[PDB]
Amino acid sequence: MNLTELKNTPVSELITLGENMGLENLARMRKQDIIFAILKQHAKSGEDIFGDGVLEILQDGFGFLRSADSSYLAGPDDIYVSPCQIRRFNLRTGDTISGKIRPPKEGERYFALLKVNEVNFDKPENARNKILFENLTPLHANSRLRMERGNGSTEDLTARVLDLASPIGRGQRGLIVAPPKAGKTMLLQNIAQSIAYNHPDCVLMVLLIDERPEEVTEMQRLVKGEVVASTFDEPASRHVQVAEMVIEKAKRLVEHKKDVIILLDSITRLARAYNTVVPASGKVLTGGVDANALHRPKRFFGAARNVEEGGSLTIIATALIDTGSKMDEVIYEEFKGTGNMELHLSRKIAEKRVFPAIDYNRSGTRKEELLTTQEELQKMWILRKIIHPMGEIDAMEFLINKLACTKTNDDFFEMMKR
Amino acid sequence: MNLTELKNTPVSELITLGENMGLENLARMRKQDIIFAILKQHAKSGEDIFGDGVLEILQDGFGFLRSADSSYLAGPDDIYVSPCQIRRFNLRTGDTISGKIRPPKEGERYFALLKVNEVNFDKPENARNKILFENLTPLHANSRLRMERGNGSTEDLTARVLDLASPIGRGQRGLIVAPPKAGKTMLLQNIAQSIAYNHPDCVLMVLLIDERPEEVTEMQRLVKGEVVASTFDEPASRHVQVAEMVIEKAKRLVEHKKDVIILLDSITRLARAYNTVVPASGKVLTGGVDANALHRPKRFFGAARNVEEGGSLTIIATALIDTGSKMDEVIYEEFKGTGNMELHLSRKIAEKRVFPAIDYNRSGTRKEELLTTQEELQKMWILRKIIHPMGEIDAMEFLINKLACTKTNDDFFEMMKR
Numbered sequence: 001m002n003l004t005e006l007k008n009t010p011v012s013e014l015i016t017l018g019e020n021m022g023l024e025n026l027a028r029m030r031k032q033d034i035i036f037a038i039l040k041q042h043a044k045s046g047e048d049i050f051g052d053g054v055l056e057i058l059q060d061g062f063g064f065l066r067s068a069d070s071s072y073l074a075g076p077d078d079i080y081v082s083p084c085q086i087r088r089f090n091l092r093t094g095d096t097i098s099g100k101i102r103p104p105k106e107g108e109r110y111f112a113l114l115k116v117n118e119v120n121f122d123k124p125e126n127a128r129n130k131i132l133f134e135n136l137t138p139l140h141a142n143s144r145l146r147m148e149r150g151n152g153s154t155e156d157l158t159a160r161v162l163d164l165a166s167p168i169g170r171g172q173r174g175l176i177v178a179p180p181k182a183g184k185t186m187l188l189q190n191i192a193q194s195i196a197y198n199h200p201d202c203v204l205m206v207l208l209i210d211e212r213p214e215e216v217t218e219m220q221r222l223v224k225g226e227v228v229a230s231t232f233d234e235p236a237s238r239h240v241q242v243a244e245m246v247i248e249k250a251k252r253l254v255e256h257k258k259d260v261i262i263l264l265d266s267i268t269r270l271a272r273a274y275n276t277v278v279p280a281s282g283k284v285l286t287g288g289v290d291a292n293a294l295h296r297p298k299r300f301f302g303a304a305r306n307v308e309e310g311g312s313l314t315i316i317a318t319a320l321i322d323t324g325s326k327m328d329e330v331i332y333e334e335f336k337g338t339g340n341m342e343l344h345l346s347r348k349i350a351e352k353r354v355f356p357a358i359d360y361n362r363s364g365t366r367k368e369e370l371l372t373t374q375e376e377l378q379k380m381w382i383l384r385k386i387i388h389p390m391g392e393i394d395a396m397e398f399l400i401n402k403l404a405c406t407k408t409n410d411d412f413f414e415m416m417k418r
Numbered sequence: 419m420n421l422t423e424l425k426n427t428p429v430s431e432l433i434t435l436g437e438n439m440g441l442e443n444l445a446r447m448r449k450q451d452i453i454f455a456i457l458k459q460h461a462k463s464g465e466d467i468f469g470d471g472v473l474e475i476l477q478d479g480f481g482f483l484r485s486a487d488s489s490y491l492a493g494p495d496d497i498y499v500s501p502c503q504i505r506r507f508n509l510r511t512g513d514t515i516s517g518k519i520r521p522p523k524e525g526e527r528y529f530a531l532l533k534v535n536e537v538n539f540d541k542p543e544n545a546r547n548k549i550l551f552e553n554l555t556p557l558h559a560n561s562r563l564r565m566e567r568g569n570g571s572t573e574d575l576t577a578r579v580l581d582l583a584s585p586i587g588r589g590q591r592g593l594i595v596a597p598p599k600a601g602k603t604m605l606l607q608n609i610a611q612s613i614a615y616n617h618p619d620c621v622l623m624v625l626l627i628d629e630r631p632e633e634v635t636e637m638q639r640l641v642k643g644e645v646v647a648s649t650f651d652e653p654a655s656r657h658v659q660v661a662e663m664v665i666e667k668a669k670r671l672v673e674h675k676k677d678v679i680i681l682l683d684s685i686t687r688l689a690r691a692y693n694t695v696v697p698a699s700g701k702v703l704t705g706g707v708d709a710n711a712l713h714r715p716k717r718f719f720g721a722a723r724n725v726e727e728g729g730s731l732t733i734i735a736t737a738l739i740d741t742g743s744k745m746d747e748v749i750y751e752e753f754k755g756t757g758n759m760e761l762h763l764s765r766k767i768a769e770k771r772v773f774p775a776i777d778y779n780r781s782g783t784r785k786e787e788l789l790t791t792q793e794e795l796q797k798m799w800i801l802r803k804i805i806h807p808m809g810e811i812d813a814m815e816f817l818i819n820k821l822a823c824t825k826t827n828d829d830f831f832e833m834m835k836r
């Protein structure tokens with residue numbers, strides 16, 4: 001009946017549903033193959049079935065509707081779309097298409113979409129009246145994203161430091177400099193919790209590249225939104241396919257004037273995947289890094305903007321430095337001046353078991369006056385004149401206790417003032 | 419009478435068993451052919467025969483029940499299974515099949531399985547009610563494996579130190595960084611004894627890749643469990659075949675809610691074996707390592723998890739560094755930020771005749787609060803502050819003498835408490 005309702009069902013329940021018609025030996029199959037077999041159970045009965053996904057356009061012209069639940073993995077249950085269908089309605093990669101599914105005919109190994117009902121949460125004819133993303137004019141970030149929960153909890157303390165260190169606004173292309181063993185993945189989970197709580201309206205997407213399988217399920221059970229990731233055992237091809245799909249899908253929501261926020265982890269691991277995928281260009285930089293390969297991740301990082309016409313696109317990527325790898329150092333150098341916002345983590349503060357390990361003296365964002373107010377910026381500048389003489393390690397020790405007593409940042413602004 | 423009881427019988431007794439019927443000149447051939455000749459002796463007698471094995475499905479469709487007593491070598495006494503026999507029961511590679519074997523007929527050079535009695539130590543009909551491996555949801559390790567023996571023996575200090583430095587739980591994807599001549603194999607033998615003593619329930623499998631034939635028989639006489647190895651004289655195809663057959667056999671036991679532990683030695687030798695077998699993809703990394711070659715071993719190393727439904731899969735693979743080869747260093751770079759826990763062996767401590775030579779500063783685990791108790795973790799962090807300023811050689815020397823005074827680790831904590 002509802003394909004998207006079937007995918008989110010646990011595999012144990014899929015066995016019982018398969019046994020209802022009379023299917024057998026389903027327990028020794030993949031999760032996707034069970035859905036494909038179950039979709040045939042409704043095919044014989046002729047009952048109407050609904051399913052959606054994210055369109056991926058192949059080089060030949062015929063595409064598929066990848067599922068966001070399976071992290072856009074090419075499975076047998078992917079809905080097929082004919083090349084003629086993408087011409088009647090102007091569609092490209094990343095378009096969210098929902099409609100009825102017809103059973104495959106003879107010679108068809110994939111289910112096909114019979115009628116297009118909604119495209120990007122809009123009518124098919126309405127979606128063709130939207131201006132393309134690259135034709136839009138970028139504008140500076142001016143809508144502040146309030147990262148503070150306001151409950152004064154221990155986890156909210158990290159957000160208060162983040163707000164005080166570097167303000168982040170809609171469309172701001174941030175970047176996090178993360179040395180290894182510094183609580184980087186703990187910081188990202190705090191951001192996703194605050195974003196989905198303070199601003200439920202904006203679409204939140206979390207993209208993890210080369211992440212441990214035990215880390216993917218921790219993020220999926222924690223982030224209130226859409227979490228898509230590719231484990232390290234997957235090939236380098238799957239690292240860029242799962243990345244291009246996310247940015248293409250994110251662009252479409254901008255064309256419909258929706259605020260979209262992407263949390264990336266990590267840009268360094270994404271770039272190395274591109275270096276493997278692309279053919280050698282002859283001219284190779286130091287450390288085995290292909291200088292031509294860096295263009296593709298720069299396109300991914302350069303897509304973040306605040307569109308004047310409406311909406312925005314926020315990318316908060318994490319950079320891995322001090323990892324003991326020559327290639328990881330080369331990647332970070334290319335994205336040095338590119339990031340609109342920079343946040344630095346201190347390894348030494350992590351060894352003090354002090355969280356968040358925020359290097360306040362070497363973090364911040366340009367054009368912060370467009371985000372904050374006049375009085376807010378001046379109060380922050382007072383702390384900038386206070387923390388700067390102090391060292392990095394003791395600054396967080398001093399800053400954490402000061403922010404602990406006050407529940408809110410403005411309350412703290414009334415503390416150090418007097 | 420029993421094929422598995424025939425294999426473990428020494429070849430001297432097999433000659434006596436062969437001479438009882440009247441078989442002539444059996445001494446001048448391999449032990450595999452002697453078993454095959456003895457089996458044909460009972461073929462004409464007509465008495466029922468018994469045996470078991472581990473499946474290995476070829477691309478053609480048929481399989482063989484290789485035996486772990488011969489390190490899954492393609493012996494002439496491997497039981498053949500029909501392509502439809504793996505269809506009536508939903509079978510796949512790595513399934514442990516036991517049952518009566520019928521003698522080969524005319525045109526058949528291999529023994530054939532006549533009746534499937536037990537699959538994975540379970541009824542052949544209940545084996546198809548188990549969910550596949552990858553469909554299981556991975557999770558963080560939260561059940562600590564008590565590596566401490568507690569008897570106060572001299573070799574117990576090796577395990578007692580390891581529990582102090584890097585706690586290991588069920589499903590903990592570990593990684594041991596071992597330079598050459600640092601007592602690596604002495605550490606593995608100590609682990610395989612404490613695990614087989616403290617936790618008899620978990621399936622302890624030890625896999626040695628590219629190891630000397632001398633060390634194989636040393637491990638087989640010490641480890642109380644399955645010890646399967648491939649010597650260096652074996653081709654590169656045997657290293658990957660003997661490694662795929664081990665992870666697949668471990669995956670099946672996970673589906674039956676059984677904890678399985680794999681002690682790999684070493685992930686570097688395994689990766690180099692895969693680099694030889696797989697074809698060139700056109701992109702070559704530094705040091706001669708193919709880019710897509712490392713995808714296969716990462717899947718082997720990435721299968722370790724603590725399945726939420728039940729059971730686990732613990733892989734402890736050794737990494738070889740400082741071997742003077744650029745290929746060995748490249749492999750370690752890819753598996754750097756991959757394992758759940760790391761344990762660094764130090765050459766300098768080994769040259770001081772200090773055992774175990776463990777680099778306490780650079781060794782540690784992740785999410786250790788899940789394994790250890792609240793108060794135990796506090797004591798460990800107290801120890802970290804003491805060790806942190808000390809060097810590698812002195813701290814291990816300081817730790818060893820302190821641990822020798824007390825019988826148990828917690829008793830040692832009291833001595834250093836005040």
Ligand SMILES: O=C1C=CC(=O)N1CCN1C(=O)C=CC1=O
Binds near residue numbers: 500501502503
């Ligand atoms: O074609 C397949 C695939 C598995 C399988 O057993 N067979 C048939 C083999 N087979 C005969 O043709 C007559 C007796 C018998 O066992």
Ligand SMILES: [Mg+2]
Binds near residue numbers: 763764
């Ligand atoms: Mg060591």
